[PDB]
PDB file of N, CA and C in Angstrom:
ATOM      1  N   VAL A   1     -48.980 113.028 -19.302  1.00 26.57           N
ATOM      2  CA  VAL A   1     -48.818 111.551 -19.741  1.00 26.57           C
ATOM      3  C   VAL A   1     -50.586 110.980 -20.090  1.00 26.57           C
ATOM      4  N   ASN A   2     -51.250 112.584 -20.431  1.00 25.97           N
ATOM      5  CA  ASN A   2     -52.953 112.485 -20.871  1.00 25.97           C
ATOM      6  C   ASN A   2     -53.627 112.183 -19.435  1.00 25.97           C
ATOM      7  N   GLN A   3     -53.350 113.163 -18.837  1.00 24.06           N
ATOM      8  CA  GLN A   3     -54.272 112.761 -17.654  1.00 24.06           C
ATOM      9  C   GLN A   3     -55.467 113.016 -17.288  1.00 24.06           C
ATOM     10  N   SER A   4     -56.442 113.263 -18.571  1.00 23.06           N
ATOM     11  CA  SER A   4     -57.906 113.902 -18.811  1.00 23.06           C
ATOM     12  C   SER A   4     -58.360 113.004 -19.027  1.00 23.06           C
ATOM     13  N   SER A   5     -58.785 111.592 -18.417  1.00 25.23           N
ATOM     14  CA  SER A   5     -59.398 110.366 -19.261  1.00 25.23           C
ATOM     15  C   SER A   5     -59.864 109.753 -18.042  1.00 25.23           C
ATOM     16  N   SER A   6     -59.592 109.762 -17.077  1.00 24.30           N
ATOM     17  CA  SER A   6     -59.853 108.699 -15.706  1.00 24.30           C
ATOM     18  C   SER A   6     -59.432 107.255 -15.373  1.00 24.30           C
ATOM     19  N   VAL A   7     -58.983 107.173 -16.545  1.00 24.12           N
ATOM     20  CA  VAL A   7     -58.067 105.870 -16.638  1.00 24.12           C
ATOM     21  C   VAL A   7     -56.909 106.076 -17.396  1.00 24.12           C
ATOM     22  N   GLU A   8     -55.955 106.774 -16.748  1.00 26.80           N
ATOM     23  CA  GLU A   8     -54.778 107.248 -17.774  1.00 26.80           C
ATOM     24  C   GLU A   8     -53.543 105.937 -18.049  1.00 26.80           C
ATOM     25  N   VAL A   9     -52.672 106.207 -18.677  1.00 26.17           N
ATOM     26  CA  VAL A   9     -51.416 105.093 -18.842  1.00 26.17           C
ATOM     27  C   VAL A   9     -50.486 105.465 -17.563  1.00 26.17           C
ATOM     28  N   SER A  10     -49.712 104.456 -17.537  1.00 28.70           N
ATOM     29  CA  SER A  10     -48.721 104.730 -16.624  1.00 28.70           C
ATOM     30  C   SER A  10     -47.562 105.694 -16.726  1.00 28.70           C
ATOM     31  N   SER A  11     -46.746 105.766 -17.985  1.00 30.26           N
ATOM     32  CA  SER A  11     -45.822 106.793 -18.027  1.00 30.26           C
ATOM     33  C   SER A  11     -46.006 106.734 -19.608  1.00 30.26           C
ATOM     34  N   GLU A  12     -45.209 107.771 -19.914  1.00 29.11           N
ATOM     35  CA  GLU A  12     -45.284 108.049 -21.564  1.00 29.11           C
ATOM     36  C   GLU A  12     -45.001 107.155 -22.276  1.00 29.11           C
ATOM     37  N   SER A  13     -44.304 106.388 -21.675  1.00 29.61           N
ATOM     38  CA  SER A  13     -43.275 105.261 -22.228  1.00 29.61           C
ATOM     39  C   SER A  13     -44.275 104.582 -23.253  1.00 29.61           C
ATOM     40  N   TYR A  14     -45.749 104.244 -22.442  1.00 29.41           N
ATOM     41  CA  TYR A  14     -46.819 103.179 -23.195  1.00 29.41           C
ATOM     42  C   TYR A  14     -47.522 104.040 -23.793  1.00 29.41           C
ATOM     43  N   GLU A  15     -47.242 105.521 -24.629  1.00 31.61           N
ATOM     44  CA  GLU A  15     -48.045 106.261 -25.224  1.00 31.61           C
ATOM     45  C   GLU A  15     -47.284 106.782 -26.300  1.00 31.61           C
ATOM     46  N   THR A  16     -46.066 105.870 -26.595  1.00 29.39           N
ATOM     47  CA  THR A  16     -45.284 105.837 -27.815  1.00 29.39           C
ATOM     48  C   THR A  16     -44.943 104.824 -28.710  1.00 29.39           C
ATOM     49  N   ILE A  17     -44.508 104.655 -29.968  1.00 29.12           N
ATOM     50  CA  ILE A  17     -44.483 103.515 -30.581  1.00 29.12           C
ATOM     51  C   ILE A  17     -43.011 103.700 -30.858  1.00 29.12           C
ATOM     52  N   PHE A  18     -42.029 103.091 -29.944  1.00 27.91           N
ATOM     53  CA  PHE A  18     -40.633 103.468 -30.164  1.00 27.91           C
ATOM     54  C   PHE A  18     -40.551 102.647 -31.103  1.00 27.91           C
ATOM     55  N   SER A  19     -40.056 103.343 -32.501  1.00 26.35           N
ATOM     56  CA  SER A  19     -40.039 103.063 -33.917  1.00 26.35           C
ATOM     57  C   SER A  19     -38.366 102.278 -34.038  1.00 26.35           C
ATOM     58  N   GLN A  20     -38.005 101.516 -34.588  1.00 25.73           N
ATOM     59  CA  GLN A  20     -36.546 101.213 -34.656  1.00 25.73           C
ATOM     60  C   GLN A  20     -36.546 101.645 -36.216  1.00 25.73           C
ATOM     61  N   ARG A  21     -36.318 102.517 -36.734  1.00 23.95           N
ATOM     62  CA  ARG A  21     -36.305 102.934 -37.995  1.00 23.95           C
ATOM     63  C   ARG A  21     -35.186 103.921 -37.871  1.00 23.95           C
ATOM     64  N   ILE A  22     -34.199 103.632 -38.330  1.00 25.83           N
ATOM     65  CA  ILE A  22     -32.742 104.453 -38.158  1.00 25.83           C
ATOM     66  C   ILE A  22     -32.513 105.816 -39.374  1.00 25.83           C
ATOM     67  N   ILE A  23     -32.462 106.878 -38.982  1.00 26.03           N
ATOM     68  CA  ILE A  23     -32.769 107.671 -39.930  1.00 26.03           C
ATOM     69  C   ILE A  23     -31.440 108.740 -40.164  1.00 26.03           C
ATOM     70  N   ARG A  24     -30.728 109.073 -40.758  1.00 25.98           N
ATOM     71  CA  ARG A  24     -29.543 110.008 -40.766  1.00 25.98           C
ATOM     72  C   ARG A  24     -29.355 111.086 -41.481  1.00 25.98           C
ATOM     73  N   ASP A  25     -28.595 112.085 -41.478  1.00 24.36           N
ATOM     74  CA  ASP A  25     -28.741 113.249 -42.073  1.00 24.36           C
ATOM     75  C   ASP A  25     -28.196 113.119 -43.507  1.00 24.36           C
ATOM     76  N   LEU A  26     -28.133 114.205 -44.411  1.00 25.18           N
ATOM     77  CA  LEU A  26     -27.485 114.083 -45.626  1.00 25.18           C
ATOM     78  C   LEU A  26     -26.410 113.552 -45.495  1.00 25.18           C
ATOM     79  N   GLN A  27     -25.217 114.186 -45.290  1.00 25.43           N
ATOM     80  CA  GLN A  27     -24.024 113.123 -44.756  1.00 25.43           C
ATOM     81  C   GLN A  27     -22.741 113.819 -46.073  1.00 25.43           C
ATOM     82  N   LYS A  28     -21.766 114.443 -45.368  1.00 26.84           N
ATOM     83  CA  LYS A  28     -20.785 115.100 -46.123  1.00 26.84           C
ATOM     84  C   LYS A  28     -20.446 113.902 -47.393  1.00 26.84           C
ATOM     85  N   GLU A  29     -19.982 114.692 -48.583  1.00 27.52           N
ATOM     86  CA  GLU A  29     -19.857 113.754 -49.666  1.00 27.52           C
ATOM     87  C   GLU A  29     -18.260 113.538 -49.820  1.00 27.52           C
ATOM     88  N   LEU A  30     -17.756 112.257 -49.928  1.00 28.22           N
ATOM     89  CA  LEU A  30     -16.685 112.252 -50.161  1.00 28.22           C
ATOM     90  C   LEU A  30     -16.221 112.303 -51.658  1.00 28.22           C
ATOM     91  N   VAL A  31     -15.132 112.542 -51.573  1.00 27.58           N
ATOM     92  CA  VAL A  31     -14.479 113.168 -53.163  1.00 27.58           C
ATOM     93  C   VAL A  31     -13.272 112.571 -53.444  1.00 27.58           C
ATOM     94  N   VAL A  32     -12.356 112.967 -52.557  1.00 27.46           N
ATOM     95  CA  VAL A  32     -11.046 112.735 -52.991  1.00 27.46           C
ATOM     96  C   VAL A  32     -10.128 111.157 -52.538  1.00 27.46           C
ATOM     97  N   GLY A  33     -11.316 110.421 -51.557  1.00 27.52           N
ATOM     98  CA  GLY A  33     -10.685 109.022 -51.193  1.00 27.52           C
ATOM     99  C   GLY A  33     -10.671 108.342 -52.806  1.00 27.52           C
ATOM    100  N   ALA A  34     -11.288 108.455 -53.548  1.00 27.63           N
ATOM    101  CA  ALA A  34     -11.248 107.542 -54.460  1.00 27.63           C
ATOM    102  C   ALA A  34     -11.501 107.939 -56.063  1.00 27.63           C
ATOM    103  N   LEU A  35     -10.650 109.377 -56.139  1.00 26.30           N
ATOM    104  CA  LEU A  35     -10.503 109.913 -57.426  1.00 26.30           C
ATOM    105  C   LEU A  35      -9.437 109.089 -57.802  1.00 26.30           C
ATOM    106  N   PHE A  36      -8.228 109.378 -56.997  1.00 24.91           N
ATOM    107  CA  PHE A  36      -7.107 108.965 -57.413  1.00 24.91           C
ATOM    108  C   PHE A  36      -6.919 106.996 -57.690  1.00 24.91           C
ATOM    109  N   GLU A  37      -6.135 106.737 -58.316  1.00 22.70           N
ATOM    110  CA  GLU A  37      -5.897 105.770 -59.282  1.00 22.70           C
ATOM    111  C   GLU A  37      -4.877 104.712 -58.173  1.00 22.70           C
ATOM    112  N   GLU A  38      -4.729 103.524 -58.035  1.00 24.98           N
ATOM    113  CA  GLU A  38      -4.390 102.841 -56.867  1.00 24.98           C
ATOM    114  C   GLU A  38      -3.059 102.175 -57.447  1.00 24.98           C
ATOM    115  N   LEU A  39      -2.249 102.140 -56.775  1.00 26.25           N
ATOM    116  CA  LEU A  39      -0.801 101.250 -57.015  1.00 26.25           C
ATOM    117  C   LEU A  39      -0.536  99.876 -56.108  1.00 26.25           C
ATOM    118  N   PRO A  40      -0.783  98.827 -56.925  1.00 26.15           N
ATOM    119  CA  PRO A  40      -0.968  97.766 -55.654  1.00 26.15           C
ATOM    120  C   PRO A  40       0.309  97.280 -55.582  1.00 26.15           C
ATOM    121  N   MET A  41       1.143  97.832 -54.419  1.00 25.58           N
ATOM    122  CA  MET A  41       2.084  97.760 -54.105  1.00 25.58           C
ATOM    123  C   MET A  41       2.426  96.501 -53.226  1.00 25.58           C
ATOM    124  N   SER A  42       3.000  95.373 -53.624  1.00 28.29           N
ATOM    125  CA  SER A  42       3.016  93.845 -52.657  1.00 28.29           C
ATOM    126  C   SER A  42       3.941  94.061 -51.881  1.00 28.29           C
ATOM    127  N   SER A  43       4.824  95.143 -51.626  1.00 31.73           N
ATOM    128  CA  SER A  43       5.899  94.947 -50.796  1.00 31.73           C
ATOM    129  C   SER A  43       5.958  96.528 -49.892  1.00 31.73           C
ATOM    130  N   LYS A  44       6.839  96.174 -49.127  1.00 28.17           N
ATOM    131  CA  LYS A  44       7.423  97.416 -48.329  1.00 28.17           C
ATOM    132  C   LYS A  44       7.330  98.545 -48.913  1.00 28.17           C
TER     133      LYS A  44
ATOM    134  N   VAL B   1     -28.954 103.778 -22.337  1.00 24.39           N
ATOM    135  CA  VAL B   1     -27.482 103.929 -21.813  1.00 24.39           C
ATOM    136  C   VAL B   1     -26.517 102.811 -22.022  1.00 24.39           C
ATOM    137  N   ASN B   2     -26.679 101.633 -21.054  1.00 23.17           N
ATOM    138  CA  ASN B   2     -25.079 100.692 -21.492  1.00 23.17           C
ATOM    139  C   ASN B   2     -24.643 101.122 -21.819  1.00 23.17           C
ATOM    140  N   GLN B   3     -23.536 102.031 -21.722  1.00 20.35           N
ATOM    141  CA  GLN B   3     -22.750 102.534 -22.818  1.00 20.35           C
ATOM    142  C   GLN B   3     -21.632 101.793 -23.036  1.00 20.35           C
ATOM    143  N   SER B   4     -21.258 100.901 -21.718  1.00 19.84           N
ATOM    144  CA  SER B   4     -20.359  99.977 -22.037  1.00 19.84           C
ATOM    145  C   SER B   4     -19.639 100.353 -23.042  1.00 19.84           C
ATOM    146  N   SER B   5     -19.710  99.574 -24.451  1.00 21.37           N
ATOM    147  CA  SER B   5     -18.557  99.913 -25.011  1.00 21.37           C
ATOM    148  C   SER B   5     -19.395  99.927 -26.577  1.00 21.37           C
ATOM    149  N   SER B   6     -19.003 101.189 -27.223  1.00 21.97           N
ATOM    150  CA  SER B   6     -19.048 101.662 -28.853  1.00 21.97           C
ATOM    151  C   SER B   6     -20.645 101.112 -29.278  1.00 21.97           C
ATOM    152  N   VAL B   7     -21.339 102.085 -29.427  1.00 22.94           N
ATOM    153  CA  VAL B   7     -22.439 101.868 -29.790  1.00 22.94           C
ATOM    154  C   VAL B   7     -23.252 102.043 -28.924  1.00 22.94           C
ATOM    155  N   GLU B   8     -24.625 102.691 -28.748  1.00 21.62           N
ATOM    156  CA  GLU B   8     -25.424 102.969 -27.279  1.00 21.62           C
ATOM    157  C   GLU B   8     -26.899 103.018 -28.420  1.00 21.62           C
ATOM    158  N   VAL B   9     -27.629 102.694 -27.440  1.00 20.90           N
ATOM    159  CA  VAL B   9     -28.895 102.518 -27.617  1.00 20.90           C
ATOM    160  C   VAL B   9     -29.342 103.959 -28.273  1.00 20.90           C
ATOM    161  N   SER B  10     -29.418 104.708 -27.291  1.00 21.30           N
ATOM    162  CA  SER B  10     -30.248 106.001 -27.378  1.00 21.30           C
ATOM    163  C   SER B  10     -30.998 106.359 -25.853  1.00 21.30           C
ATOM    164  N   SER B  11     -31.979 105.810 -25.557  1.00 24.24           N
ATOM    165  CA  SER B  11     -32.383 105.908 -24.385  1.00 24.24           C
ATOM    166  C   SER B  11     -32.754 104.514 -23.696  1.00 24.24           C
ATOM    167  N   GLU B  12     -33.067 104.693 -22.411  1.00 21.28           N
ATOM    168  CA  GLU B  12     -33.427 103.551 -21.812  1.00 21.28           C
ATOM    169  C   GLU B  12     -34.503 102.795 -22.360  1.00 21.28           C
ATOM    170  N   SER B  13     -35.337 103.846 -22.702  1.00 22.77           N
ATOM    171  CA  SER B  13     -36.467 103.130 -23.732  1.00 22.77           C
ATOM    172  C   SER B  13     -36.330 102.256 -24.819  1.00 22.77           C
ATOM    173  N   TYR B  14     -34.942 102.415 -25.294  1.00 23.83           N
ATOM    174  CA  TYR B  14     -34.725 101.892 -26.211  1.00 23.83           C
ATOM    175  C   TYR B  14     -33.583 100.654 -25.512  1.00 23.83           C
ATOM    176  N   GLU B  15     -33.776 100.225 -24.608  1.00 24.13           N
ATOM    177  CA  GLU B  15     -32.805  99.056 -24.046  1.00 24.13           C
ATOM    178  C   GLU B  15     -33.936  98.254 -23.251  1.00 24.13           C
ATOM    179  N   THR B  16     -35.306  98.664 -23.257  1.00 25.42           N
ATOM    180  CA  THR B  16     -36.266  97.884 -22.544  1.00 25.42           C
ATOM    181  C   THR B  16     -37.647  97.422 -23.137  1.00 25.42           C
ATOM    182  N   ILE B  17     -38.161  96.485 -22.646  1.00 23.81           N
ATOM    183  CA  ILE B  17     -39.498  95.725 -23.381  1.00 23.81           C
ATOM    184  C   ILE B  17     -40.818  96.016 -22.612  1.00 23.81           C
ATOM    185  N   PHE B  18     -41.483  96.880 -23.313  1.00 23.84           N
ATOM    186  CA  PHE B  18     -42.531  97.657 -22.556  1.00 23.84           C
ATOM    187  C   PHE B  18     -43.850  96.321 -22.527  1.00 23.84           C
ATOM    188  N   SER B  19     -43.990  95.894 -21.345  1.00 24.97           N
ATOM    189  CA  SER B  19     -45.019  94.932 -21.337  1.00 24.97           C
ATOM    190  C   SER B  19     -46.358  95.546 -21.217  1.00 24.97           C
ATOM    191  N   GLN B  20     -47.856  95.067 -21.296  1.00 28.06           N
ATOM    192  CA  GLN B  20     -48.550  95.350 -20.876  1.00 28.06           C
ATOM    193  C   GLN B  20     -49.417  94.626 -20.017  1.00 28.06           C
ATOM    194  N   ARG B  21     -48.710  93.262 -19.292  1.00 29.33           N
ATOM    195  CA  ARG B  21     -49.478  92.686 -18.173  1.00 29.33           C
ATOM    196  C   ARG B  21     -49.850  93.569 -16.969  1.00 29.33           C
ATOM    197  N   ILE B  22     -51.034  93.099 -16.618  1.00 29.74           N
ATOM    198  CA  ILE B  22     -51.592  94.154 -15.575  1.00 29.74           C
ATOM    199  C   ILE B  22     -51.469  93.387 -14.442  1.00 29.74           C
ATOM    200  N   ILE B  23     -50.901  93.666 -13.281  1.00 29.51           N
ATOM    201  CA  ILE B  23     -50.986  93.032 -12.135  1.00 29.51           C
ATOM    202  C   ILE B  23     -51.812  93.936 -11.078  1.00 29.51           C
ATOM    203  N   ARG B  24     -52.271  93.438 -10.191  1.00 27.19           N
ATOM    204  CA  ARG B  24     -53.058  93.778  -8.781  1.00 27.19           C
ATOM    205  C   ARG B  24     -52.725  92.947  -7.770  1.00 27.19           C
ATOM    206  N   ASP B  25     -52.302  94.079  -6.417  1.00 26.86           N
ATOM    207  CA  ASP B  25     -51.567  93.359  -5.106  1.00 26.86           C
ATOM    208  C   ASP B  25     -52.898  92.419  -5.060  1.00 26.86           C
ATOM    209  N   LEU B  26     -52.911  91.996  -3.550  1.00 30.55           N
ATOM    210  CA  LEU B  26     -53.718  91.213  -3.158  1.00 30.55           C
ATOM    211  C   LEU B  26     -55.025  91.541  -2.863  1.00 30.55           C
ATOM    212  N   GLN B  27     -55.488  93.169  -3.010  1.00 29.80           N
ATOM    213  CA  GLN B  27     -56.683  93.577  -3.124  1.00 29.80           C
ATOM    214  C   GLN B  27     -57.112  93.270  -1.952  1.00 29.80           C
ATOM    215  N   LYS B  28     -58.164  93.245  -1.379  1.00 29.04           N
ATOM    216  CA  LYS B  28     -59.066  93.172  -0.404  1.00 29.04           C
ATOM    217  C   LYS B  28     -60.516  92.253  -0.300  1.00 29.04           C
ATOM    218  N   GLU B  29     -60.480  91.627   0.541  1.00 27.00           N
ATOM    219  CA  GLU B  29     -61.396  90.714   0.130  1.00 27.00           C
ATOM    220  C   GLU B  29     -62.748  91.618   0.615  1.00 27.00           C
ATOM    221  N   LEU B  30     -63.982  91.144   0.060  1.00 27.31           N
ATOM    222  CA  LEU B  30     -65.053  91.619   0.127  1.00 27.31           C
ATOM    223  C   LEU B  30     -65.941  90.830   0.507  1.00 27.31           C
ATOM    224  N   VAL B  31     -66.411  90.732   2.415  1.00 28.24           N
ATOM    225  CA  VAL B  31     -67.165  90.027   2.780  1.00 28.24           C
ATOM    226  C   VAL B  31     -68.785  90.153   3.033  1.00 28.24           C
ATOM    227  N   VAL B  32     -68.890  91.240   3.460  1.00 26.65           N
ATOM    228  CA  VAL B  32     -70.197  92.016   3.639  1.00 26.65           C
ATOM    229  C   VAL B  32     -70.979  92.210   2.632  1.00 26.65           C
ATOM    230  N   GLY B  33     -70.830  93.023   1.727  1.00 28.58           N
ATOM    231  CA  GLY B  33     -71.551  93.225   0.442  1.00 28.58           C
ATOM    232  C   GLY B  33     -72.531  91.747  -0.056  1.00 28.58           C
ATOM    233  N   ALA B  34     -72.223  90.974   0.206  1.00 27.27           N
ATOM    234  CA  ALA B  34     -72.722  89.764  -0.485  1.00 27.27           C
ATOM    235  C   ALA B  34     -73.612  88.904   0.198  1.00 27.27           C
ATOM    236  N   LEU B  35     -73.076  89.085   2.026  1.00 28.23           N
ATOM    237  CA  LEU B  35     -73.536  87.945   2.785  1.00 28.23           C
ATOM    238  C   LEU B  35     -75.291  88.198   2.496  1.00 28.23           C
ATOM    239  N   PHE B  36     -76.137  89.208   2.579  1.00 23.81           N
ATOM    240  CA  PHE B  36     -77.038  89.205   2.824  1.00 23.81           C
ATOM    241  C   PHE B  36     -78.181  88.983   1.501  1.00 23.81           C
ATOM    242  N   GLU B  37     -79.639  88.850   2.067  1.00 23.81           N
ATOM    243  CA  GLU B  37     -80.302  88.515   0.832  1.00 23.81           C
ATOM    244  C   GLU B  37     -80.983  89.480   0.446  1.00 23.81           C
ATOM    245  N   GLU B  38     -81.692  89.650  -0.951  1.00 24.85           N
ATOM    246  CA  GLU B  38     -81.967  91.020  -1.521  1.00 24.85           C
ATOM    247  C   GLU B  38     -83.802  91.020  -1.487  1.00 24.85           C
ATOM    248  N   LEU B  39     -84.609  92.024  -1.158  1.00 21.96           N
ATOM    249  CA  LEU B  39     -85.856  91.887  -1.270  1.00 21.96           C
ATOM    250  C   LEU B  39     -86.158  92.659  -2.663  1.00 21.96           C
ATOM    251  N   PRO B  40     -86.418  91.953  -3.703  1.00 23.16           N
ATOM    252  CA  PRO B  40     -86.554  92.476  -4.728  1.00 23.16           C
ATOM    253  C   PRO B  40     -87.811  93.777  -4.790  1.00 23.16           C
ATOM    254  N   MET B  41     -87.386  94.785  -4.486  1.00 25.80           N
ATOM    255  CA  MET B  41     -88.549  95.528  -4.017  1.00 25.80           C
ATOM    256  C   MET B  41     -88.909  96.251  -5.686  1.00 25.80           C
ATOM    257  N   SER B  42     -90.140  96.910  -6.103  1.00 23.87           N
ATOM    258  CA  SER B  42     -89.975  97.053  -7.506  1.00 23.87           C
ATOM    259  C   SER B  42     -90.792  98.696  -7.330  1.00 23.87           C
ATOM    260  N   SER B  43     -90.786  99.317  -6.227  1.00 21.28           N
ATOM    261  CA  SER B  43     -91.250 100.428  -5.817  1.00 21.28           C
ATOM    262  C   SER B  43     -90.446 101.075  -4.784  1.00 21.28           C
ATOM    263  N   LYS B  44     -91.099 102.180  -4.570  1.00 21.88           N
ATOM    264  CA  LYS B  44     -89.887 103.092  -3.573  1.00 21.88           C
ATOM    265  C   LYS B  44     -89.990 102.330  -2.107  1.00 21.88           C
TER     266      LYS B  44
END
């Protein structure tokens, strides 16, 4: 916790900027969900 | 944590509000140091 200071912080939690920015990885590409055309069935 | 259901924050630190209010306990009262008077010496 940066203890070389003579007046250190309580816990590391006050030494961070919890940033709520949500990032995600590149993510699989979806190819065949929609290549195909759709038959609007209206019955079973 | 609070994994109760579906979607979870990440960690406790992301389920908490980190205040910066600072508190001190009852401390101790200082009685002696100030009771007496000073002889403004200007020399050894």
